[PDB]
């Protein structure tokens, strides 16, 4: 298959590919945001695997060594949502809750992770 | 540390970093040439780990999805050797044995792997 699939096989957690994708952890680039609670929610229930996957991701991270902005994080689909909900100004984006993101219709836990943490980033 | 070190830690065979380097498997780009016999020689003696490392490398490969030529494979140091030994013509290079490579003074098993298989490549 793809890049994530291969990497997951490499670390031995291929089992979680479909799971991880079906909740919008589909891009190895943006797999690195997953948070403990995200795996809990996603049904990666084995604490062993939670710890392991998390560690692997930490290593993957070390390893890498406006509508416009939505494209930058590969979140263009949601541009529609944001405009329909009147979130054009960055000011308003700056104080977006994850619920706010969820509430305007970004359902996938992963996506909504990707976008919430990109905002936080933009704070700094 | 570096890129190989991190990847080896990721697949759990960090033990073999120094070993792998000290025999000139130092570049993740060119780790993919290692052959069964190379690990045997290098002292990666556990058949389990031999199989495992080899599989991981196979995945790493799928994952990636003249003096002049020596530079291309990051083997410039050996340019001296080749000229001192009168291996300037590609014809002669084409039929180089690994011993021939070894015999002209490319000691490190890894390096000499990198260069021998680059020739084979250039045959096709």
Curated annotation (Swiss-Prot), chains A, B:
Compartments, as annotated in UniProt: Cytoplasm
Domain SAM: 4-63
Subunit (UniProt): Binds the CaM kinase domain of CASK. Forms a ternary complex with CASK and LIN7A, LIN7B or LIN7C. Competes with APBA1 that forms a similar complex with CASK and LIN7 proteins. The tripartite complex CASKIN1/CASK/LIN7(A/B/C) binds the cytoplasmic tail of NRXN1. Polymerizes, via the tandem SAM domains, to form long, 8 nM wide fibers, upon which other proteins can assemble.
Described function: May link the scaffolding protein CASK to downstream intracellular effectors.
Protein name, as recorded: Caskin-1
Gene: Caskin1
Boundaries of the shown chain within the full protein: 550 to 611 of 1431
